[PDB]
Amino acid sequence: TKPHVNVGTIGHVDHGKTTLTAAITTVLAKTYGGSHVEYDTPTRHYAHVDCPGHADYVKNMITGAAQMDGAILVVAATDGPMPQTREHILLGRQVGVPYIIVFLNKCDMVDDEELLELVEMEVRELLSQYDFPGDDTPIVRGSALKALEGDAEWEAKILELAGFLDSYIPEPERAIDKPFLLPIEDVFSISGRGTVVTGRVERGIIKVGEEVEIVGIKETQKSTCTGVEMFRKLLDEGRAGENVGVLLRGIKREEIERGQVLAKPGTIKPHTKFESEVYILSKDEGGRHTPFFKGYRPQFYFRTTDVTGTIELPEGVEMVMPGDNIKMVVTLIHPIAMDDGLRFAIREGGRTVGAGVVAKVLG
Amino acid sequence: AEITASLVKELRERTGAGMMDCKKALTEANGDIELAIENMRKSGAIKAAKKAGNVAADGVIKTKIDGNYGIILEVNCQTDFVAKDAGFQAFADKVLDAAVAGKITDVEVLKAQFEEERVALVAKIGENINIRRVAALEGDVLGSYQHGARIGVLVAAKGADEELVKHIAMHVAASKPEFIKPEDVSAEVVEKEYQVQLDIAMQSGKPKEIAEKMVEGRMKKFTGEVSLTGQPFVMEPSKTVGQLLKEHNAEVTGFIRFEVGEGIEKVETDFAAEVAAMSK
Ligand SMILES: Nc1nc2c(ncn2[C@@H]2O[C@H](COP(=O)(O)OP(=O)(O)O)[C@@H](O)[C@H]2O)c(=O)[nH]1
Ligand SMILES: [Cl-]
Ligand SMILES: [Cl-]
């Protein structure tokens, strides 16, 4: 059940991103056996997208496409970086791609080592200018094409790139390894047992005897789990992905509500104000038919409940049309449990008209 | 002069040209930087020609006003990464400035003046770039609105303050009227559309006398919805823009709306499919 890593290629049209990706699949299949592409190293499973457009990538990130755990910046060594290469890296910085590996392509077309060096140093400098660790960045010297045609020397460099995917991108964290969190869907009391909340364990594990915090909407409370059950059957623990009822010591029915979360103590906080990246559905996707303006006052749907919020549009923006994607600062009317990367829907009258992701928590 | 890594760097720091293009140019030029730059000029025309058949459906709309005279402009490229690039931007701003200063409405005149600078930019950036269209609006009062880089609008008005013109330009950006007033729609066009709607209404089983009356209603809806003053004002749709203008004792004498890539079919791509092809 090997780890899953989401990667993507970013680079100039013509520098060989499609060819590199074909070479990766070909050589890994040849070596280790057998819109997105997939391939496998002995220890990792990869899902690989291309990043052809800035707005398209930001939109897909918001509307559900899993975020990249790492990106492969493809730069042909014949040219070196393009003026828009800083826009490629700037996208990476914008969406918080945590790691960038460089594949220097077309090195079969370049003999002077001192020129490859000049290209390498330009890339490291560019990376650093946007706070990626340029000095420590893996840079592979390869030929996507000649590797695809089965040339042995160049096949090695594909394997080297896959080596860095394996070693330089940390094993992503499985949901079950994360601190316990359960979004509360319903609440009731059992005469002889007490208060029970239900929902789907989003991450981690809750066991009998462990403390939990109840977070969001109202002031945080603390309690102890005295039981976990599934289909009226008592369990010793509830795990990420299971639908459960968590029995709680002391706390009463009317002190908990839908939209709050159960969490491992100290691991998630309530917030009201945050920066986000937002995408507003087009009419054809079932969204609004008309634009909204500064006083737009929608609901922000976090996990299991709507929270009304007011919006601040970025400087110089006074109108938002269906199909637009923009940054906005949101102030909710009461707190909700959240951290960076939390996804939400935007709704009006209970109908989804947009989607967003929390980019930075403010207050 | 000897062709060192340092000299190549200097020509690259200077031109943004590809590393190898720089070495080749500089070598052929015996190290004369200025001659290398001139060599790269003739090469660049051929690099640009290679790209000129590439669909360029991204890019920017820009607008600029100089008193009673305004310019709206479309400059295309292939990806929004280049549309955001500072060099591409400065090029589009330079073309815009010259069109305003020279009152240039013939896009071929504009193209000719900037062709060499276009080629040098294409040789650096490696995307097709095209000065696609330009138009002027003249008016008593002019205002503009930019919806990001993708939609630009000019509006000409009379008796309207800065804020009102702006809101009307925003309305045009969102609602894309193609006439100012419903009475501006020609009798010929109205009669054609009448026939369209009567045909549709009849085959749907409506008796003729009923269909005729319904279609006369559709004609008022039709001229209302393609015209600025007949459209509900986007910032307060309980009123038309016409009512808005009456309230302010104003009128609109003109508008132009450009949107990037209008009338260009954009190239559909399946990365997964393309990758599969290459490997198999
Ligand atoms: N010489 C050489 N050409 C390459 C290499 N990789 C790709 N190409 C060629 O460069 C062109 C564009 O590559 P492609 O993968 O389609 O670029 P993409 O638009 O970034 O996906 C094609 O003619 C490829 O065959 C390489 O390593 N060496
Ligand atoms: Cl609104
Ligand atoms: Cl007409």
Side-chain angles (χ1 to χ4, degrees), chain A residues 41-362:
Chain A
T41 57
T43 64
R44 304 270 192 265
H45 173 69
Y46 292 97
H48 179 141
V49 300
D50 200 46
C51 303
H54 186 112
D56 297 330
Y57 183 79
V58 171
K59 173 185 166 170
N60 294 338
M61 193 267 275
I62 293 162
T63 54
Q67 305 200 41
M68 287 182 290
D69 306 301
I72 304 168
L73 174 64
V74 184
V75 181
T78 51
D79 290 331
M82 310 305 277
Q84 60 272 31
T85 296
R86 63 176 65 244
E87 271 73 36
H88 297 142
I89 294 167
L90 195 44
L91 174 64
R93 171 53 57 229
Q94 175 174 359
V95 300
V97 186
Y99 298 95
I100 294 183
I101 285 165
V102 182
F103 189 85
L104 276 203
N105 203 21
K106 309 198 192 198
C107 295
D108 59 290
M109 302 297 290
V110 186
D111 65 317
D112 198 322
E113 287 294 332
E114 232 172 311
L115 283 204
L116 286 168
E117 212 98 83
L118 274 179
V119 172
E120 273 181 319
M121 291 317 308
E122 289 188 7
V123 174
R124 292 193 188 285
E125 167 63 16
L126 269 178
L127 281 169
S128 285
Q129 281 180 19
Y130 297 98
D131 302 312
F132 291 100
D135 296 339
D136 305 317
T137 295
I139 300 195
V140 183
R141 298 175 170 195
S143 168
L145 183 62
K146 285 299 173 77
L148 185 63
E149 291 166 355
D151 190 332
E153 176 200 317
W154 291 116
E155 274 180 355
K157 293 298 190 174
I158 303 299
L159 296 178
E160 173 176 308
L161 169 64
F164 283 122
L165 293 181
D166 288 341
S167 75
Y168 187 67
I169 303 179
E171 180 178 331
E173 212 180 358
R174 299 183 148 109
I176 193 169
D177 287 311
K178 293 178 180 170
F180 170 64
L181 185 125
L182 176 136
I184 295 166
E185 297 182 45
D186 198 17
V187 188
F188 36 93
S189 53
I190 307 302
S191 305
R193 287 195 199 168
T195 298
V196 184
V197 308
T198 59
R200 184 193 159 269
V201 184
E202 181 183 308
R203 38 173 142 103
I205 301 173
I206 180 63
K207 318 183 186 182
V208 173
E210 303 185 317
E211 295 192 80
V212 302
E213 280 181 337
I214 302 105
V215 185
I217 307 176
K218 67 187 90 170
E219 199 185 296
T220 291
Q221 313 164 83
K222 203 184 293 164
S223 186
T224 310
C225 169
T226 58
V228 183
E229 67 175 54
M230 185 175 188
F231 300 134
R232 306 166 298 282
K233 172 192 67 156
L234 206 41
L235 301 181
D236 284 75
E237 71 186 32
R239 303 177 182 176
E242 300 177 338
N243 293 277
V244 294
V246 180
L247 289 72
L248 298 175
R249 193 199 311 286
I251 195 156
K252 297 296 175 79
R253 190 270 135 84
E254 37 278 323
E255 286 164 322
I256 306 174
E257 78 193 74
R258 184 175 182 99
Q260 300 189 289
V261 306
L262 290 187
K264 188 189 201 318
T267 63
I268 195 166
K269 289 170 183 79
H271 294 287
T272 57
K273 190 173 173 162
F274 63 90
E275 306 184 348
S276 64
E277 297 268 12
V278 152
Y279 173 72
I280 307 294
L281 305 190
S282 66
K283 177 177 173 172
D284 286 352
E285 297 161 333
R288 300 175 55 98
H289 296 198
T290 66
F292 61 80
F293 305 87
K294 64 171 184 180
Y296 186 51
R297 184 190 177 83
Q299 280 68 47
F300 295 85
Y301 191 86
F302 293 98
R303 289 191 241 262
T304 53
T305 202
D306 266 353
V307 187
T308 293
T310 51
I311 63 171
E312 293 169 66
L313 300 172
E315 191 177 341
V317 179
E318 291 195 56
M319 179 173 65
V320 187
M321 281 168 62
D324 285 355
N325 69 283
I326 58 152
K327 296 185 190 79
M328 55 169 63
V329 175
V330 172
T331 312
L332 303 180
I333 63 169
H334 57 64
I336 209 87
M338 69 168 69
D339 209 335
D340 295 353
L342 178 61
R343 290 171 183 275
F344 56 91
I346 302 170
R347 315 206 303 168
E348 62 188 41
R351 181 181 287 190
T352 297
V353 294
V357 44
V358 174
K360 189 185 167 184
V361 173
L362 290 176

Side-chain angles (χ1 to χ4, degrees), chain B residues 21-150:
Chain B
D21 293 349
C22 286
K23 177 168 181 178
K24 181 178 197 285
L26 204 37
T27 300
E28 287 178 22
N30 191 28
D32 184 329
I33 295 290
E34 311 304 326
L35 183 54
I37 292 178
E38 175 56 31
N39 291 342
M40 301 207 299
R41 199 173 67 81
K42 308 183 88 185
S43 286
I46 301 306
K47 299 169 60 48
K50 236 177 183 170
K51 304 291 181 195
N54 292 357
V55 177
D58 211 285
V60 298
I61 304 308
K62 289 196 181 265
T63 51
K64 183 174 190 183
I65 292 169
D66 163 18
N68 301 106
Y69 195 91
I71 287 288
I72 187 162
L73 178 73
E74 186 172 2
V75 188
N76 296 118
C77 56
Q78 302 176 215
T79 66
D80 64 354
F81 286 119
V82 165
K84 293 170 192 281
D85 170 77
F88 176 81
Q89 286 283 319
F91 173 75
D93 288 333
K94 206 183 170 188
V95 175
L96 179 72
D97 288 340
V100 169
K103 288 179 159 53
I104 299 164
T105 60
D106 182 346
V107 74
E108 294 183 312
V109 168
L110 212 52
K111 288 168 167 290
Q113 180 181 341
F114 285 95
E115 171 66 11
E116 289 203 325
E117 198 176 333
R118 191 195 68 88
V119 162
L121 188 61
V122 173
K124 277 159 63 59
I125 280 179
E127 286 192 1
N128 194 23
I129 289 163
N130 187 41
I131 299 168
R132 188 200 186 191
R133 54 182 173 155
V134 67
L137 193 63
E138 298 182 77
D140 180 27
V141 177
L142 294 170
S144 63
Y145 175 68
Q146 285 288 333
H147 197 77
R150 279 183 182 289

